[PDB]
Every structure is written in structure tokens, then in C-alpha cells.
Design a protein around this ligand. Structure first.
Ligand code: LDE
Ligand code: ZN
Ligand code: ZN
Length: 393
């Protein structure tokens, strides 16, 4: 059979656990959670990267649904609860296809019965409003990882896409990591500064993840992971879940985006300005310099290098579907994963290598978080510390 046919067979046995899909945010923004208007039991290819049929075609067997909310708007906690509610409603609406999963055992139970294990991951520490009790509430509602920052610093952690702030994790930041370890919530180091990565690895007693990051050595962008951090994963036990975002994985796309941003500033606009006037400027740039397009090969280049440095036991996949408007050719929506698996087969990846990449590593890592949590919950009570106590007024 072809490598694509083989890929599909492999995925039927050991499907993809995807680390980060922003369907809930997409539903919030497109239709304010009017789920009938974007029914994922129907074909949503006109509007979304994700629906149930494409998840099945893509060989997705578990999904961490992102409950991302903006850090630059008030009411992050309320919005996070709305995102969690959206995930809950999706699970309730589609019991034939989705099964809530809170544990590694739940993931295996879902796989045994042919339903997509549906987990939740919060994207940014602003979702807890500097409150450890709020962190515990999110865990109680089903959140199983939290990215420590999004694109901006918060009071206790530095983001890769912001200026240096506290220098990594503050004292309170370390306390958040300790509490995540005690609860069994995975520490997610996507988005954070390299300093923050190192501080989190120093502090964490549980395996950490990167829910959607690729390799900085392969493509130098702050959203990607440095080799020295990848090297620490085998000791930590965690895993890096490669992402598909073109401007992170393809050199030409990083360079293009930098030039686009420079061009915006040359016209007196902030690079993130979305006014009609700014859009006209950007359109003119893209007119004279077409947007480069990444491929499956681009993503495989990251996995090859990440495998070499981090090890096959420390890799996963986090596509960022519905979180980015642009995708590599061959990975245009959630149905694309078999194309990546086929490319890896062609590059000599073994069947057991690929079962680790898709399924086994993610289940091991969540089980490890549970194991560490059992020990810590037995050893001490929850923390009552405040950010003022630990970081000062
Ligand atoms: C606003 C909302 C859709 C942002 C997403 N939650 P994201 O953080 O998942 C996508 C981003 C790449 C795409 C971009 O730069 O926006 C990244 O991961 O760095
Ligand atoms: Zn992100
Ligand atoms: Zn996201």
C-alpha cells in the first residue's frame, strides 16, 4: 500500500492526541456560541478548520480543546468559564462522537469505544486572575493544562512575544507551577519566554508540555523551543507538541512576516493594527510580495530535529487548528494529519515511533501528572499564598 494508506492504518490503531485546537474561540468570535450556526455534525469547511467528519478523517482520537481568552480585555475569568461551557456543550451535543476526558484512563476508554477524548487546556495565566483558588476551580471544571502566558507578559511570567518582565517566573509564578503540580494540571510552556521555560523546568516536579510549539533551531522565532530546552525534556519527562503555524515553521514565512510588520511600521501603523487603512497597506505589501506557503515537509523538518534533540518519547502534535488563519499545504484542516504521518514514514520513522508521537507520549505525560499529584496531595494541603505575599506590593 501507499504511505498514505499505511498512515491511515497506523492512525486507526494509535490516533492523534492533538495538543491545541481553538474551535471554542472560533465559535465565540464567529457566532457567539450559537452552535446550531456552526454545527460540527455537518460540514463546516467554509468557516472552520474543524468539524467531526474531518476530525475522523484526520485520525484525531483525542483533542485538547483550547479555552483561550484575550489577555488584553477585562473579565478573563468570566470569558474562560464561557469557553469551558462551550466545550461542555459540544460534548453534550455530540455523544456519539465525543467523550469528556479528565484522565489518561479516560483517554484510553474513549479510544476503546471509538470516541474522541475531549480535554481542555487554558491558554494563558491571565485566566486565573492571580488567584490560586481560581486555578483550582479551573481544574475542578476540567482544565488539564494551562499555558503560563499568552502573547503578553502577566504579573508572574514572561511571554516570548513581549519584553523581559520578571525575568522568567516570579516567586508567585513558581508558586503557580507548584500548585499546578499538586493539582495535576500540566504546565504548558508554549508562548512563554525561554527564561520562563527554564524557570518552569527548574521548579516543576511533573512532566511539562508545549501544547503548540516547534523548533527554534530549525526556524528562529521566539514562539519556538530552543535546543537547550528540548534537551531537558528527557529528564523532565515532558513533551513538545509540534505546531503547524506557517510563520513559525517556515523560514521564508518568518522572514516575510517580519518584513510585513516592518512595512506596517514604515507607514506609521502598529504591526497589529487592523483598521481599513492599515489593511490597505498590508494588502499592497502582499501584492508585491506574495505570502510564502509551508508544506508537510516543513513540519516534518521540525519533527526530525526535535526527535534528534528531545527524543522520540518527548514529541507530540499540536496543530493550532482554528487558532491561525494560515496553514501548510497538505495540512489545511484537521483532516490533514495522515499526510504528515505518511511523510514521516517516507523519512523512515517506525510504527512504534509514530504511535508515541500520536498517542502514547501524551497519555504517559497526563498519567505522570496524575501520579505526581497523588504524591503532593497526600503530602500537603493546597496553597493559600497571594501574589502580594510572594512578589511584594
Ligand atoms: C486570538 C486567538 C485566535 C489566538 C490563538 N489562541 P493562538 O495563540 O493559538 C495562535 C497563535 C498563532 C497565530 C497568531 O499569531 O495569531 C499562537 O499560538 O502563537
Ligand atoms: Zn497559542
Ligand atoms: Zn490558541
Amino acid at each position: 500500500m501507499t504511505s498514505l494508506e499505511k498512515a491511515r492504518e497506523l492512525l486507526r490503531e494509535f490516533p492523534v492526541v492533538d495538543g491545541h485546537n481553538d474551535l471554542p474561540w472560533a465559535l465565540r468570535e464567529q457566532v457567539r456560541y450559537d452552535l446550531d450556526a456552526r454545527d460540527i455534525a455537518a460540514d463546516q469547511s467554509a468557516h472552520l478548520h474543524t468539524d467531526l467528519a474531518r476530525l475522523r478523517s484526520g485520525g484525531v482520537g483525542a483533542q485538547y480543546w483550547s479555552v483561550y481568552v484575550r489577555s488584553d480585555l477585562p473579565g478573563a475569568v468570566t470569558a474562560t468559564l464561557e469557553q469551558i461551557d462551550c466545550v461542555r456543550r459540544l460534548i453534550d451535543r455530540h455523544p456519539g462522537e465525543l467523550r469528556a476526558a479528565l484522565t489518561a484512563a479516560d483517554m484510553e476508554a474513549a479510544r476503546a469505544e471509538g470516541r474522541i477524548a475531549s480535554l481542555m487546556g487554558a491558554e494563558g495565566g491571565h485566566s486565573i486572575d492571580n488567584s490560586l483558588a481560581t486555578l483550582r476551580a479551573l481544574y475542578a471544571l476540567g482544565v488539564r493544562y494551562m499555558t503560563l502566558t499568552h502573547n503578553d507578559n502577566n504579573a508572574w511570567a514572561d511571554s516570548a512575544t513581549d519584553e523581559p518582565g520578571v525575568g522568567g517566573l516570579s516567586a508567585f509564578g513558581r508558586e503557580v507551577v507548584r500548585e499546578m503540580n499538586r493539582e495535576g494540571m500540566l504546565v504548558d510552556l508554549s508562548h512563554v519566554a525561554a527564561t520562563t521555560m527554564r524557570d518552569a523546568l527548574d521548579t516543576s516536579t511533573a512532566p511539562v508540555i508545549f501544547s503548540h510549539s516547534s523548533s527554534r533551531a530549525v526556524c528562529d522565532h521566539p514562539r519556538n523551543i530552543p535546543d537547550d530546552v528540548l534537551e531537558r525534556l528527557s529528564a523532565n519527562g515532558g513533551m513538545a507538541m509540534v505546531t503547524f503555524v506557517p510563520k513559525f515553521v517556515l523560514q521564508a514565512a518568518v522572514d516575510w512576516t517580519a518584513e510585513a510588520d516592518d512595512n506596517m511600521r514604515a507607514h506609521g501603523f502598529h504591526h497589529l493594527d487592523s483598521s481599513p487603512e492599515a489593511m490597505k497597506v498590508h494588502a499592497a505589501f502582499e501584492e508585491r510580495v506574495p505570502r510564502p506557503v509551508a508544506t508537510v515537509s516543513t513540519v516534518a523538518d521540525h519533527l526530525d530535529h526535535m526527535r534528534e534533540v528531545a527524543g522520540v518519547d518527548h514529541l507530540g502534535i499540536g496543530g493550532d487548528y482554528d487558532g491561525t488563519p494560515f496553514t501548510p499545504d497538505g495540512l489545511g484542516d484537521v483532516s490533514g494529519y495522515p499526510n504528515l504521518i505518511a511523510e514521516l514514514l517516507d523519512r523512515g520513522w517506525s510504527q512504534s515511533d509514530l504511535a508515541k508521537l500520536t498517542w502514547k507520549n501524551a497519555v504517559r505525560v497526563l498519567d505522570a501528572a496524575e501520579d505526581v499529584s497523588r504524591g503532593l496531595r497526600a503530602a500537603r494541603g493546597p496553597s493559600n499564598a497571594t501574589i502580594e505575599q510572594l512578589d511584594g506590593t
